[PDB]
Design a protein around this ligand. Structure first.
Ligand SMILES: *c1ccc([N+](=O)[O-])cc1C(=O)Nc1ccccc1
Ligand SMILES: *c1ccc([N+](=O)[O-])cc1C(=O)Nc1ccccc1
Ligand SMILES: *c1ccc([N+](=O)[O-])cc1C(=O)Nc1ccccc1
Ligand SMILES: CC(C)(Oc1ccc([C@@H]2CC2(Cl)Cl)cc1)C(=O)O
Length: 270
């Protein structure tokens, strides 16, 4: 249990709560509705989509996407939410003791492979069996409407709902997700890592606080730590399959222009 570790556990917790505006507590209260009778605007078909797109009429006109196919509009603003999460993650990583001290090539490498493995883990916080919160909790896209899209777009988010359902069953709080996300970033297994030895030292410190933190917060889930280690493996597989589907859609779809920042991350990944 010790004391210095508890401080580190909360440095990682105070960060995250500061960099990620949408956490599990806020999301879990919206989906519960036990704090407001003003539910979010549900998006379950093309009509509700075009309605919700009436608000964001400026972002679409200036971006030249107003008259694009429905699938290209969704996975284009949704692509904009990941560019924001990558920025927040880059700042959250600074709170990880030892990360700012590593070589820039290693920092860029760790974030290059860990951003999406964490985007999908945190994405589960705003997901249930029927949909996921969007627009900072103001909207709610249905899990079925995303499947109703034409392939391959309909095969993009369904795997995320699959992981989220099994992941959310572990019943973690932001205190646990923070350390978990920190462990994802500190992974000495990423390809091309220079000082592969030091990063392993930094990962052991985080993974150790995570094991002790889970043992202290979820005392009855003896094997919660092994379960999370398995989830880290599934996230790596989930990102691999996802990144492969972006390259496929990047050439076979002449109307879906990938974002520049995300274009560098997906380059020569898996
Ligand atoms: C993304 C796609 C479509 C819309 N829309 O039809 O309004 C909105 C968004 C979105 O993420 N908006 C947003 C902006 C700023 C902060 C939170 C959410
Ligand atoms: C980001 C947020 C919202 C929208 N939108 O719905 O108009 C678009 C974006 C965005 O980043 N679009 C984009 C795509 C490709 C290259 C640059 C910018
Ligand atoms: C896509 C990925 C992540 C989020 N998010 O968690 O804020 C949202 C979206 C998204 O596509 N939102 C959306 C779609 C359509 C209309 C409004 C908002
Ligand atoms: C997690 C998420 C939403 O996955 C995507 C989805 C769509 C795209 C864009 C449209 C093509 Cl396929 Cl060029 C890139 C990444 C993201 O990275 O923002």
């Amino acid at each position: 249990m010790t004391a210095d570790l508890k401080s580190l556990a909360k440095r990682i917790y105070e960060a995250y709560l500061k960099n990620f505006n949408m956490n599990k507590v806020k999301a879990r209260v919206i989906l519960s509705g036990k704090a407001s009778n003003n539910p979010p605007f549900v998006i379950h078909d093309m009509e509700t989509l075009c309605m919700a797109e009436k608000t964001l009429v400026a972002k679409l006109v200036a971006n030249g996407i107003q008259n694009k196919e429905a699938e290209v509009r969704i996975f284009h603003c949704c692509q904009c939410t990941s560019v924001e999460t990558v920025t927040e993650l880059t700042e959250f990583a600074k709170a990880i003791p030892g990360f700012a001290n590593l070589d820039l090539n290693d920092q860029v490498t760790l974030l290059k492979y860990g951003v999406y493995e964490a985007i999908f883990a945190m994405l589960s916080s705003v997901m249930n069996k029927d949909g996921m919160l969007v627009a900072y909790g103001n909207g709610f896209i249905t899990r079925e409407f995303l499947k109703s899209l034409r392939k391959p777009f309909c095969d993009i988010m369904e795997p995320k709902f699959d992981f989220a359902m099994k992941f959310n069953a572990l019943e973690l709080d932001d205190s646990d997700i923070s350390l978990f996300v920190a462990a994802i970033i500190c992974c000495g297994d990423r390809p091309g890592l220079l000082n592969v030895g030091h990063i392993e030292k930094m990962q052991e410190g985080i993974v150790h606080v995570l094991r002790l933190h889970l043992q202290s917060n979820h005392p009855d889930d003896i094997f919660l730590f092994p379960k999370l280690l398995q989830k880290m493996a599934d996230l790596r597989q989930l990102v691999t399959e996802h990144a492969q589907l972006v390259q496929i859609i990047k050439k076979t779809e002449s109307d879906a222009a990938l974002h520049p920042l995300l274009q560098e991350i997906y380059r020569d990944m898996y």
